Amino acid sequence: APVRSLNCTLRDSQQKSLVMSGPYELKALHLQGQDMEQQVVFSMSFVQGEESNDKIPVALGLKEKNLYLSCVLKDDKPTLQLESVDPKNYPKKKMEKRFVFNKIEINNKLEFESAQFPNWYISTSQAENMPVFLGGGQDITDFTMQFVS
Ligand SMILES: C[C@H]1CN(C(=O)Cn2cccn2)CCO1
């Protein structure tokens, strides 16, 4: 039947929140109190793909927006982008591979591996207000999820 989706927020293992800074642009920063309304709410879709006990294929769309995180080669490197889609056709169970992350449960945290680019992860910097990026050292790949109404 329809693809199944949950509303959620993500925080990195230094408890940095993710926000839409600019057009098609994600950064991460320490947020608490009133300013937490600025955080991005995801619609996490459970999509078709290779699955195991602790490795579950998802897509990450922005809640009630036709925008998905997407892994594509840019100037010859796997990168993370926000990509616009046809709002009539999404979300769907058979998401294209560039939209698919393997959500991996390791030591009570989550990592989001690119299905398209093995061993490349959704990452943040230790520094405040820096972009969210694909990284596959010195990066944060460990998140926690908060389930939203
Ligand atoms: C969703 C990400 C997209 N960002 C990029 O920098 C993409 N990019 C990397 C190398 C070249 N382009 C900014 C932060 O939010």
Curated annotation (Swiss-Prot):
Changing residue 117 to C: No effect on binding to IL1R or on IL1B activity. Markedly reduced activity. Markedly reduced activity. Keywords: Cytokine, Cytoplasm, Inflammatory response, Lysosome, Mitogen, Pyrogen, Secreted. Activation of the IL1B precursor involves a CASP1-catalyzed proteolytic cleavage. Processing and secretion are temporarily associated. (Microbial infection) Cleavage by S.pyogenes cysteine protease SpeB promotes its activation independently of CASP1. SpeB-mediated maturation of IL1B plays a dual role depending on infection site: while IL1B inflammatory response prevents bacterial growth during invasive skin infections, it promotes streptococcal infection of the nasopharynx by disrupting colonization resistance mediated by the microbiota. Induction: By LPS. Transcription and translation induced by M.tuberculosis and a number of different M.tuberculosis components in macrophages; EsxA is the most potent activator tested (at protein level). In pancreatic islets, release is increased by high glucose treatment. In pancreatic islets and macrophages, release is also increased by endocannabinoid anandamide/AEA. Expressed in activated monocytes/macrophages (at protein level). The IL1B production occurs in 2 steps, each being controlled by different stimuli. First, inflammatory signals, such as LPS, stimulate the synthesis and promote the accumulation of cytosolic stores of pro-IL1B (priming). Then additional signals are required for inflammasome assembly, leading to CASP1 activation, pro-IL1B processing and eventually secretion of the active cytokine. IL1B processing and secretion are temporarily associated. The record marks 4 as: Involved in receptor binding. The keyword Cytoplasm applies. GO terms for biological process: apoptotic process; astrocyte activation; cell-cell signaling; cellular response to interleukin-17; cellular response to lipopolysaccharide; cellular response to mechanical stimulus; cellular response to xenobiotic stimulus; cytokine-mediated signaling pathway. A motif (Involved in interaction with TMED10 C-terminus) lies at residues 112-125. GO terms for molecular function: cytokine activity; integrin binding; interleukin-1 receptor binding; protein domain specific binding. Belongs to the IL-1 family. Potent pro-inflammatory cytokine. Initially discovered as the major endogenous pyrogen, induces prostaglandin synthesis, neutrophil influx and activation, T-cell activation and cytokine production, B-cell activation and antibody production, and fibroblast proliferation and collagen production. Promotes Th17 differentiation of T-cells. Synergizes with IL12/interleukin-12 to induce IFNG synthesis from T-helper 1 (Th1) cells. Plays a role in angiogenesis by inducing VEGF production synergistically with TNF and IL6. It comes from Homo sapiens. This is Interleukin-1 beta. The chain holds residues 117 to 268 of 269 of the full protein. The record marks 55, 63, 65, 74, 88 as: Important for interaction with integrin. Monomer. In its precursor form, weakly interacts with full-length MEFV; the mature cytokine does not interact at all. Interacts with integrins ITGAV:ITGBV and ITGA5:ITGB1; integrin-binding is required for IL1B signaling. Interacts with cargo receptor TMED10; the interaction is direct and is required for the secretion of IL1B mature form. Interacts with HSP90AB1; the interaction facilitates cargo translocation into the ERGIC. Interacts with HSP90B1; the interaction facilitates cargo translocation into the ERGIC. GO terms for cellular component: cytosol; extracellular region; extracellular space; lysosome; secretory granule. The keyword Cytoplasm applies. Its main location: cytoplasm. It is found in: Cytoplasm, Cytosol; Secreted; Lysosome; Secreted, Extracellular exosome.
